[PDB]
Amino acid sequence: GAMNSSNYAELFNNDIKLFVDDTNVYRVTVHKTFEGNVATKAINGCIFTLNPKTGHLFLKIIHTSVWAGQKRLSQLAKWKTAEEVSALVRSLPKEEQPKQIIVTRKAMLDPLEVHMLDFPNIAIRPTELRLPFSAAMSIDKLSDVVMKATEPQMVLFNIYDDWLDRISSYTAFSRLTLLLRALKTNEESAKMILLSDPTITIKSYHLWPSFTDEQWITIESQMRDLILTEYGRKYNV
């Protein structure tokens, strides 16, 4: 059924699974027209499809041309997401196909179930977890490839860099969600925490800085402080 805190360890077992987040598929800026009306202008988007055990991220870039001449774009975006996820599954060898796909938003359930009717053994599940994957576009290298795209494109990343050489998947996912939650809550402060030290850099082939184990402990504490600080600011606590 639904994925929650009670069955959280399931994320890191040996059954292949993918999270799908569609929050950045259809992106717009809202502006005034010359006549004083309001209009939207779409910008490039992306599907965030993530294997939480391995860190493999299938980033399908949604180019704005896919919306041209289409109506009800917020509805269409869910079905386009489901179409692209189904196409990805079919593109994978059988032994790499997921046994479960967990959607971060319940409105994705029916579009994905319908697109996956040919795969009756792949469970489509919601989750009760509030996952911060909308903040993926706060990761500079992901945002850059999305905004530079001139056509539909799939780009593959490992969202954990090389962390699994030193930590478990459970700890890696915990770090990722903390970092993403911090970037979502206060993007400027989170980026300052991550980059303030000139001596620590991001490898060309990585998304995050090359922190030692002890430095990651400091960073994680600073991210938790940021989240708590923002909570106090928001609620006057």
Partner 1 sequence: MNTVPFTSAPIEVTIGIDQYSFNVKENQPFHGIKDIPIGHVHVIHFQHADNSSMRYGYWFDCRMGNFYIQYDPKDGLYKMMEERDGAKFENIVHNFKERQMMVSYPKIDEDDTWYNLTEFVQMDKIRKIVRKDENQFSYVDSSMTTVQENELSDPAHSLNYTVINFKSREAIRPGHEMEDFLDKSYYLNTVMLQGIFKNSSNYFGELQFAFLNAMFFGNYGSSLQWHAMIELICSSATVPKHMLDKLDEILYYQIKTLPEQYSDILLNERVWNICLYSSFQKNSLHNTEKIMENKYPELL
In the complex, the residues that contact partner 1 under the rule CB under 8 A are 76, 79, 82-83, 110-111, 113-115, 117-118
Report which DSSP code applies to 25.
T
Nearest residue (CB) to partner 1, 78 versus 175: 78
Nearest residue (CB) to partner 1, 55 versus 111: 111
Nearest residue (CB) to partner 1, 79 versus 211: 79
CB of 118 to partner 1, least distance (A): 7
Contact 3, 34 (CB under 8 A): no
CB of 107 to partner 1, least distance (A): 13
CB of 56 to partner 1, least distance (A): 26
CB of 206 to partner 1, least distance (A): 37
Nearest residue (CB) to partner 1, 83 versus 230: 83
CB of 47 to partner 1, least distance (A): 16
Q: What angle in degrees, to the nearest 10, is found between the helix axes of 187-195 and 169-185?
A: 130
Q: Is 36 left (phi over 0), alpha (psi -120 to 50) or beta?
A: left
3-state SS class at 188: helix
How many Å separate Cα 212 from the centre of its chain? 25
Nearest residue (CB) to partner 1, 114 versus 192: 114
